[PDB]
Design an enzyme around this catalytic site. Sequence first.
Site, PDB file in Angstrom:
ATOM      1  N   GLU A  16       1.228  -1.231  -0.130  1.00 19.48           N
ATOM      2  CA  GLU A  16      -0.514  -0.060   0.083  1.00 19.48           C
ATOM      3  C   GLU A  16       0.924   1.588  -0.032  1.00 19.48           C
ATOM      4  O   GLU A  16       1.874   1.012  -0.364  1.00 19.48           O
ATOM      5  CB  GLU A  16      -0.868   0.115   1.368  1.00 19.48           C
ATOM      6  CG  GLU A  16      -0.117  -0.866   2.748  1.00 19.48           C
ATOM      7  CD  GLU A  16       1.144   0.525   2.890  1.00 19.48           C
ATOM      8  OE1 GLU A  16       0.776   1.625   2.997  1.00 19.48           O
ATOM      9  OE2 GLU A  16       2.276  -0.187   2.821  1.00 19.48           O
ATOM     10  N   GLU A  54       4.586  -0.868   1.827  1.00 13.30           N
ATOM     11  CA  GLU A  54       4.546  -0.501  -0.218  1.00 13.30           C
ATOM     12  C   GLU A  54       4.811  -2.041  -0.781  1.00 13.30           C
ATOM     13  O   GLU A  54       4.879  -1.932  -1.886  1.00 13.30           O
ATOM     14  CB  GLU A  54       5.567   0.545  -0.134  1.00 13.30           C
ATOM     15  CG  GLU A  54       6.446   1.636   0.281  1.00 13.30           C
ATOM     16  CD  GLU A  54       7.611   2.848  -0.921  1.00 13.30           C
ATOM     17  OE1 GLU A  54       7.813   1.558  -1.920  1.00 13.30           O
ATOM     18  OE2 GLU A  54       7.707   3.325   0.289  1.00 13.30           O
TER      19      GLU A  54
HETATM   20  O1  LIG Z   1       0.796   6.551   9.100  1.00 15.81           O
HETATM   21  P1  LIG Z   1       2.128   7.252   8.221  1.00 15.81           P
HETATM   22  O2  LIG Z   1       2.737   6.965   9.716  1.00 15.81           O
HETATM   23  O3  LIG Z   1       1.812   8.027   6.996  1.00 15.81           O
HETATM   24  O4  LIG Z   1       2.715   5.632   7.971  1.00 15.81           O
HETATM   25  C1  LIG Z   1       1.708   5.421   6.462  1.00 15.81           C
HETATM   26  C2  LIG Z   1       2.294   5.592   5.406  1.00 15.81           C
HETATM   27  O5  LIG Z   1       4.065   5.393   5.720  1.00 15.81           O
HETATM   28  C3  LIG Z   1       4.136   4.232   4.857  1.00 15.81           C
HETATM   29  N1  LIG Z   1       5.886   4.856   3.091  1.00 15.81           N
HETATM   30  C4  LIG Z   1       5.655   3.930   2.296  1.00 15.81           C
HETATM   31  N2  LIG Z   1       6.257   4.764   1.134  1.00 15.81           N
HETATM   32  C5  LIG Z   1       6.530   6.030   1.835  1.00 15.81           C
HETATM   33  N3  LIG Z   1       6.892   6.900   1.550  1.00 15.81           N
HETATM   34  C6  LIG Z   1       7.317   7.922   1.540  1.00 15.81           C
HETATM   35  O6  LIG Z   1       7.434   8.789   1.033  1.00 15.81           O
HETATM   36  N4  LIG Z   1       6.437   8.033   3.546  1.00 15.81           N
HETATM   37  C7  LIG Z   1       5.851   7.072   3.752  1.00 15.81           C
HETATM   38  C8  LIG Z   1       5.736   6.007   2.768  1.00 15.81           C
HETATM   39  C9  LIG Z   1       3.364   3.558   4.351  1.00 15.81           C
HETATM   40  O7  LIG Z   1       2.832   2.889   3.012  1.00 15.81           O
HETATM   41  C10 LIG Z   1       1.970   5.148   3.918  1.00 15.81           C
HETATM   42  O8  LIG Z   1       2.167   5.480   3.208  1.00 15.81           O
HETATM   43  O1  LIG Z   2       4.619  -2.064   8.512  1.00 16.28           O
HETATM   44  C1  LIG Z   2       4.807  -1.092   7.608  1.00 16.28           C
HETATM   45  O2  LIG Z   2       4.117  -1.937   6.805  1.00 16.28           O
HETATM   46  C2  LIG Z   2       4.026   0.187   7.988  1.00 16.28           C
HETATM   47  C3  LIG Z   2       4.725   0.263   9.050  1.00 16.28           C
HETATM   48  C4  LIG Z   2       4.931   2.075   8.980  1.00 16.28           C
HETATM   49  C5  LIG Z   2       4.517   2.871   8.784  1.00 16.28           C
HETATM   50  N1  LIG Z   2       4.410   2.514   7.174  1.00 16.28           N
HETATM   51  C6  LIG Z   2       4.688   0.983   6.734  1.00 16.28           C
END
Ligand SMILES: O=P(O)(O)OC[C@H]1O[C@H](n2cnc3nc(O)ncc32)[C@H](O)[C@@H]1O
Ligand SMILES: O=C(O)c1cccnc1
Lengths: 341, 341
Positions: free
Chosen positions: A171, A314
């Site tokens: 995601e 991701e």
């Molecule tokens: O709830 P938060 O603190 O925002 O964390 C969840 C997000 O951070 C993760 N995340 C993944 N690739 C990312 N790239 C950037 O730049 N920021 C957050 C990223 C996750 O996939 C969500 O997008």
């Molecule tokens: O466990 C994960 O996939 C995760 C944890 C923090 C922020 N984004 C993703």
Amino acid sequence: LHALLRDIPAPDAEAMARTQQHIDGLLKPPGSLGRLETLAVQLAGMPGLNGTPQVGEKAVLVMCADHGVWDEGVAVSPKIVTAIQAANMTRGTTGVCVLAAQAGAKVHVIDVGIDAEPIPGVVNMRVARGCGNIAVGPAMSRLQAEALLLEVSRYTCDLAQRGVTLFGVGELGMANTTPAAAMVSVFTGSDAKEVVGIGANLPPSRIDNKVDVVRRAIAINQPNPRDGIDVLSKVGGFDLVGMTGVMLGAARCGLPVLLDGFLSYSAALAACQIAPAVRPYLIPSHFSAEKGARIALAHLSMEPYLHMAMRLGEGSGAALAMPIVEAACAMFHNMGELAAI
Amino acid sequence: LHALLRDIPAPDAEAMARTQQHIDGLLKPPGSLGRLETLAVQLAGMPGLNGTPQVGEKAVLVMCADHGVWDEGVAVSPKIVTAIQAANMTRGTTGVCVLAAQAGAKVHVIDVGIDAEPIPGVVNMRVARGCGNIAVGPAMSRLQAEALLLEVSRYTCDLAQRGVTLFGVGELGMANTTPAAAMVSVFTGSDAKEVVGIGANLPPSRIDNKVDVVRRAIAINQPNPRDGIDVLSKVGGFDLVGMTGVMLGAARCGLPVLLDGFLSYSAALAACQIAPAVRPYLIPSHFSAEKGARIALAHLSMEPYLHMAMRLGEGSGAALAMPIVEAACAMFHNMGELAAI
Ligand SMILES: O=P(O)(O)OC[C@H]1O[C@H](n2cnc3nc(O)ncc32)[C@H](O)[C@@H]1O
Ligand SMILES: O=C(O)c1cccnc1
Ligand SMILES: O=P(O)(O)OC[C@H]1O[C@H](n2cnc3nc(O)ncc32)[C@H](O)[C@@H]1O
Ligand SMILES: O=C(O)c1cccnc1
């Protein structure tokens, strides 16, 4: 949808018994390969795999969406990062991209609700421009949740028609660890404080607010824990719903799905709630560094293979575990036999 | 040998600092890739790697030898299994073989003391036809231990000249979990009962005897824990000595070595005792299902990446972890940069 759910096949016990016997006859002390053996047997019982542990094509499906809850100050990344990163996904520069290429897997970027103009190259399944703010009401309507489940489910099984035999879920969505925590709290019955983490580097100061937001979401929406769709629609998000849909689709298709981290665990809880038949198709990857990871995993009764302290999301952990799945197949098919000690 | 040991290089802090900075600038939240980031930095400090995390050719070195202690009823496999399996190693049908091929690594089978006629195709470095029975005296002489250390060390660094940049260690030797337990007991100061396991399916009944044998070995030989060579020679085996030698060689060569399971942990304790400078070059792979695994790992202060409940040996876990090392390199070199959020 109930059709879809009704038709999820049970695992093939016959194939699993044959697999177990074969494994037992390999050139090694019985049970010496531990979890690699169990995994091979698990794969053998999956109908879409044709009675043997095998891996054809691999795909990682990344569900991207924005959340209204971002407005509550629960995320340090600016909102646009979702849109930006989603574009990046098309250029192969992100973490999942790099890990997927290393595993020979293809990345499918799916927009289920980014709050921006459509991104060329991205699969368009957008529900709306970001979901509702769960702190003040539901993320979306039940109908919306069901429709998306259906659509993603179908998209998933269709890939199977094209040779994909192994999926990974991922995601992208700033603030998504918030709805993920709420779902976990709901399904497991844990208090918010126990499952709320730092997400993408949320400052320790800012935690309290995050906890309150989660509690608020729940109090306000009163999600029914016995109803996975109810929970998803009220305190989940489009991205979470999308992940759940991959799981339902792969299972219906009789194929294995690799979980990722924290967000994925929340989606898995919902999927299993909705259809317990889904369980046997799920494969853990890594142990997320997110606070609520342990609780979430205990409820799924899963023990991940990888301890990497990862917390990117991701679908990066899913990709990293693909070689392990392939290793179980290689063991199964290429080792010599005792009979030939 | 003291020359060899004296010349083990320290890690390149300059290269590591540059690596850290680069990682920090990648397209992801800082520190989000957890242990993959740490691993990349670790690799960067290894001089044989030319200032960057990289993987060229890969090799798994399997040290095969027999043990006189087999006569004490501590192993269920017949003695000949060592010789048989060693031949099998040349045909690519064993567990390590299959996992190494999957990782694109080459397997080097080394005979350091099999109690049988030489096996064609196997590298000949045989000390003797099996080592002495540790329950009644020393496994070998100090001289013998030092000579083998030297020889294996050299063989190892020579491979580096041929493009190998990553090693994996493995072994083959019926009854070897016995000397491994004795070493662990000695180095860590744990009681025998705490570190003696089932090895290759030793029946639970038979355990007691195994414990007594270990105690006997120690009482009789009185190995000095502050002297790693003393311990290896008295209560170790040729295979264990050989593994220690790969570790010393790779470190001298400034290159990384992937540990395997229980036997490998015992060898690592000796190596670190002998030369603490070796430590920075060691990389854990998996968490062995052998009883004394936790204790052994705690003393090395290592946390393995893989939890697979494996207990085969042969260097199978090492091979399985190679893709992880490569993943850290891919992340490092292929991800995009934030600057270009
Ligand atoms: O709830 P938060 O603190 O925002 O964390 C969840 C997000 O951070 C993760 N995340 C993944 N690739 C990312 N790239 C950037 O730049 N920021 C957050 C990223 C996750 O996939 C969500 O997008
Ligand atoms: O466990 C994960 O996939 C995760 C944890 C923090 C922020 N984004 C993703
Ligand atoms: O001390 P034991 O109980 O004999 O267990 C250690 C041995 O078993 C492991 N081992 C690895 N490949 C094997 N193949 C067979 O057939 N038996 C044991 C095997 C290990 O490598 C040693 O040879
Ligand atoms: O951990 C290992 O490598 C192991 C454990 C038992 C038997 N052989 C090897």
